[PDB]
Design a binder for this molecule. Structure first.
Ligand SMILES: [Cl-]
Ligand SMILES: [Cl-]
Ligand SMILES: [Cl-]
Ligand SMILES: [Cl-]
Ligand SMILES: [Cs+]
Ligand SMILES: [Cs+]
Ligand SMILES: [Cs+]
Ligand SMILES: [Cs+]
Ligand SMILES: [Cs+]
Ligand SMILES: [Cs+]
Ligand SMILES: [Cs+]
Ligand SMILES: [Cs+]
Ligand SMILES: [Cs+]
Ligand SMILES: [Cs+]
Ligand SMILES: [Cs+]
Ligand SMILES: [Cs+]
Ligand SMILES: [Cs+]
Ligand SMILES: [Cs+]
Ligand SMILES: [Cs+]
Ligand SMILES: [Cs+]
Length: 129
């Protein structure tokens, strides 16, 4: 599913992401935007052999099991494929763990590089929510 911006904001909020670990919804939306362009089905192989999955491009090295990432810890206890669902629950659940892992949203390099410090509120601007 390719979420719309506000749609995803809403779904993220619905799933308790808004201000989760103090990251406003705009941060999450922004992260999703640059991670997956709001496409729940986004997958992108990392140079290391891991793959990132889903709206938040959760990595199969640490967070989900894709069965092909030697070392996978699967810390979200989720098949990575579950991170590709139109329903973002798994992604959100796992992102909650990731963002809790110590570096906040810097876990998402694209968040750090593209969202962090920016007017992330823009991402939810106009959204009903
Ligand atoms: Cl957008
Ligand atoms: Cl925000
Ligand atoms: Cl694996
Ligand atoms: Cl933080
Ligand atoms: Cs929350
Ligand atoms: Cs909130
Ligand atoms: Cs890409
Ligand atoms: Cs790639
Ligand atoms: Cs990647
Ligand atoms: Cs990456
Ligand atoms: Cs990525
Ligand atoms: Cs990690
Ligand atoms: Cs495995
Ligand atoms: Cs593994
Ligand atoms: Cs595990
Ligand atoms: Cs789980
Ligand atoms: Cs940690
Ligand atoms: Cs960490
Ligand atoms: Cs990372
Ligand atoms: Cs800035």
């Amino acid at each position: 599913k390719v979420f719309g911006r506000c749609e995803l904001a809403a779904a993220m909020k619905r799933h308790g992401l808004d201000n989760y670990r103090g990251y406003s919804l705009g941060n999450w939306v922004c992260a999703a935007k640059f991670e997956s362009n709001f496409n729940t089905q986004a997958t992108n192989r990392n140079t290391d052999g891991s793959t990132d999955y889903g709206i938040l491009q959760i990595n199969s090295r640490w967070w989900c099991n894709d069965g092909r990432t030697p070392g996978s810890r699967n810390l979200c206890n989720i098949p990575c494929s579950a991170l590709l669902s139109s329903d973002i629950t798994a992604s959100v659940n796992c992102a909650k763990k990731i963002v809790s892992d110590g570096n906040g949203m810097n876990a998402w390099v694209a968040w750090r590089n593209r969202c962090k410090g920016t007017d992330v509120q823009a991402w939810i601007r106009g959204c009903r929510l």
